């Protein structure tokens, strides 16, 4: 039984991971229909920044050699015309590099070996010209998607293992994966958006959380644990830059456990050494990125290391509130001082956009960039619909019950005022995970989209309802505990089956022909070295297919491109034609492609381009909006009023392409 339990736990973890991979892959097939799409229609399926991330994978695989392709990526001069930029540490294209590296030798071996991994046949689209859709592993899109979905199918395994650790019985793991299965829609969105960066990084983040909980629970330490923690901290950092701010709310959770005497000395030293080494490697591999420093993840590492190493000097402290307050003051002061001693100090000037969109939520401070990000419906507060949906499946009531039980037990089994430094308080992993859930819940409530962190911790905490130590003990008896742990599971299936039904009975639309016709015109009637500017969503699609140099892309936060977006969107302002034409010529563009509904004013006011260009351009207020000129020029089919601009392309009054003289 000591081994039949472990084998069963491992096997069930692998099985739940495989089931999750199959579920995501099926949902993706239902949503997009890659089965019967030509290799140029899947690219059009990849929307705004998913196209930017897949185009570099396509660049590397198509290049004559891996080294020359990666060299072209690191010395890229077409993503932002006018500069040579490094797109590897700027966009975090490490998944693309790894996948392309694995694909090139694999395809080369398959081709020579006579293996037919790609089989496809002509598919007739009807009115439009028939195309050829290919399937199989040898297809680039399926290699990319299989990699993404294989990595994202282990989130279920990590959640099952975390449920088993934080409750110490298989029924807890079942509760956690069943809470994940029934709230799959509200916990992840990889099935629609494979190429996004969080799809590659979150599996490693939650795997790191699992390994950290295992290390804390069993008082582990040594070099093996350092290797284990580093192997998950490095890839999560190379992928998704915002990984860093996750690993900062993890440190704030370890501190609050260490300060309560729930983590030994040697274990804490192992943890912090692993963080230091992983940061050093991640900073080295990202070409010495200066945004790595001046974040909250480096100062946090240093502050926690200092608090850990000045811990033995405070053994004689007996009054717990004073000890906790002193450590908290030291931690906060060191973090704030180091962050401001490099941002405002050595002259690194970390971007202040994350603080700029938080100060707009509560304040009236608008700015063009905040309205560009806040009105996205994805950086707004969490909608009440999400809360009602999560309460409908009984994931929030169950997590809330478990949280109350843990708090009551912790208060009734601890000495709150007086501390002994020679004894470890026990149940440190549970407190780590509860504090983690409370930092994930505040982030998810402020900026929607960050519920990918919130929901899996709700599941992990709900798994805490099967802890025999809490919510009873040896008095409950085995028969009664098991009888109430299948009743809960039966009531989770009752309210969770319909969720899976409504999630499997949804199918997506069959694209739109307007974009394909526009790209056909771009390919036929435009020279290969033309430079395009336009609204950010369309630029990444123009670059992915049509291979044209561009001047602005959807991943615009980094310096030197946060200023091109205002110039580009000045076309929708009330500036004179001469001003906009001079701006566009100076940037060196030839064509400007946009959509007629971009100039369509009501929706919610102060979330349309016309309203935005009245809050930061009061001097130009009262002038005829440039958009009216565009619409009249499109309608009348004459370049009369717009002096130096030509309406080079106008089909079915959706996409308009202006030519810069």
């Amino acid at each position: 039984y000591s081994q039949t339990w472990l084998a069963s736990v491992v096997i069930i973890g692998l099985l739940v991971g495989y089931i999750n991979y199959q579920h995501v892959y099926t949902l993706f097939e239902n949503d997009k229909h890659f089965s019967h799409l030509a290799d140029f229609e899947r690219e059009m399926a990849y929307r705004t920044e998913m196209g930017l991330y897949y185009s570099y994978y396509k660049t590397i695989i198509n290049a004559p050699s891996f080294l020359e392709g990666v060299q072209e990526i690191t010395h890229d001069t077409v993503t932002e015309h006018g500069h040579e930029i490094n797109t590897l540490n700027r966009f975090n294209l490490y998944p693309e590099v790894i996948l392309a590296f694995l694909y090139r030798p694999f395809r080369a071996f398959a081709k020579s070996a006579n293996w037919q991994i790609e089989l496809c046949w002509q598919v007739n689209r009807g009115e439009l010209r028939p195309v050829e859709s290919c399937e199989g592993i040898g297809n680039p899109h399926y290699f990319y998607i299989t990699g993404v979905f294989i990595v994202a199918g282990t989130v279920a395994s990590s959640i099952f293992y975390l449920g088993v650790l934080v409750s110490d019985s298989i029924f807890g793991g079942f509760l956690s994966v069943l809470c994940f299965a029934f709230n799959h829609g509200e916990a992840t969105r990889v099935q629609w958006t494979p190429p996004l960066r969080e799809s590659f990084a979150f599996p490693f983040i939650i795997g790191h959380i699992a390994i950290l909980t295992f290390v804390i629970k069993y008082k582990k330490s040594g070099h093996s644990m350092i290797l284990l923690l580093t192997s998950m901290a490095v890839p999560a950092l190379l992928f998704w830059q915002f990984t860093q701010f996750a690993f900062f709310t993890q440190i704030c959770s370890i501190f609050l456990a260490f300060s309560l005497d729930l983590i030994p000395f040697s274990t804490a030293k192992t943890v912090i050494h692993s963080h230091i080494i992983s940061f050093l490697i991640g900073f080295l591999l990202l070409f010495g990125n200066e945004m790595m420093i001046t974040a909250l993840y480096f100062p946090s590492i240093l502050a926690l290391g200092m608090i850990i190493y000045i811990s033995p000097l405070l053994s004689n402290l007996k009054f717990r509130p004073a000890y906790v307050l002193f450590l908290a003051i030291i931690f906060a002061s060191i973090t704030l001082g180091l962050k401001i001693g490099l941002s405002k100090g050595l002259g690194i000037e970390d971007d202040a956009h994350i603080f700029d969109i938080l100060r707009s939520k509560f304040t009236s401070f608008a700015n063009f960039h905040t309205r560009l990000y806040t009105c996205s419906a994805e950086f707004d507060f969490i909608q009440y619909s999400t809360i009602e949906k999560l309460c409908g499946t009984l994931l929030i009531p169950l997590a809330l019950i478990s949280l109350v039980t843990f708090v009551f037990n912790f208060v009734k089994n601890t000495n709150l005022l007086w501390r002994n430094s020679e004894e470890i308080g026990e149940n440190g992993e549970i407190l780590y995970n509860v504090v983690q859930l409370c930092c994930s819940t505040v982030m998810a409530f402020l900026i929607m989209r960050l519920k990918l962190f919130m929901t899996p911790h709700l599941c992990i905490v709900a798994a805490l309802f099967a802890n025999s130590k809490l919510l009873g003990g040896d008095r409950i008896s085995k028969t009664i505990r098991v009888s109430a742990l299948v009743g809960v599971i039966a009531i989770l299936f009752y309210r969770g089956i319909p969720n899976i039904r409504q999630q499997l009975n949804v199918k997506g639309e069959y694209s739109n022909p307007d974009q394909e016709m526009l790209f056909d015109w771009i390919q036929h009637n435009t020279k290969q070295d033309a430079v395009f500017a336009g609204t950010m969503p369309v630029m990444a699609n123009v670059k992915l297919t049509t291979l044209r140099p561009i001047v602005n892309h959807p991943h615009y936060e980094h310096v030197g491109i946060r200023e091109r977006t205002l110039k580009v969107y000045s076309m929708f302002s009330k500036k004179p034609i001469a001003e906009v034409h001079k701006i566009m010529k100076e940037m060196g563009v030839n064509y400007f492609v946009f959509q007629l509904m971009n100039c369509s004013n009501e929706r919610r006011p102060e979330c349309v381009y016309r309203g935005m260009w009245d809050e930061e351009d009061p001097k130009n207020s009262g002038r005829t909006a440039l958009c009216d000129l565009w619409i009249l020029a499109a309608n009348s089919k004459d370049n009369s009023r717009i002096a130096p601009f030509k309406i080079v392309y106008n089909a079915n009054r959706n996409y308009i392409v202006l030519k810069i003289l």
Partner: antibody
Amino acid sequence: EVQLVESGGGLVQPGGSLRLSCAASGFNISSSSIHWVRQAPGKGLEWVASISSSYGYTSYADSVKGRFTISADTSKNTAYLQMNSLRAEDTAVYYCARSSSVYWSWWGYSAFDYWGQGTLVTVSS
Amino acid sequence: DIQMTQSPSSLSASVGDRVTITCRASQSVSSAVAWYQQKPGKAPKLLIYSASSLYSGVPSRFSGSRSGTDFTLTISSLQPEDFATYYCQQGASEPITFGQGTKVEIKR
């Protein structure tokens, strides 16, 4: 000079109530904690209750928890112990001792350097 | 929750004899221990605090020591007025616990 003086003892029928006073001369209360200690006839010393008057923090011995109430008013520089539902085992001599404030505890309470003269309370039906 | 246990529950010695009383703490109060003496019918009087620091105004023949969780009170030159009951205290937790006591009488 600094000194503690106890008063208000005597005889009480079992199950009754008794309020006993500790007056401090010299040092100003609310700058320190004051504790009550029991000497039962022929037994050792036992700790009863503690009060820090600056922010009104009180602590009790698990035996007397829910029966005793320790309250200090800085106006007259005095502390009071109101003890109800006296059993037959509460007959003893009560001492008032001075220690450091709980907020400045930090490495634990200081030793009781100044003690009262003791007040005898006898519970007998 | 923390218990102080004094070993020699009764000690008998005559003047001029070294005397040692020992206290054992179940937990690990670091050095918050104190030693009092009480003569019959009168309140205690602090002798030692912190397990080593002689209180001001007491004769310097009393000494304190600590090793691990074993605390020791030592009297070098016993004198007629050094015949009382000696108590051990811990102040590192909330329930402040004394020791069961030791009585030093006249040997004969």
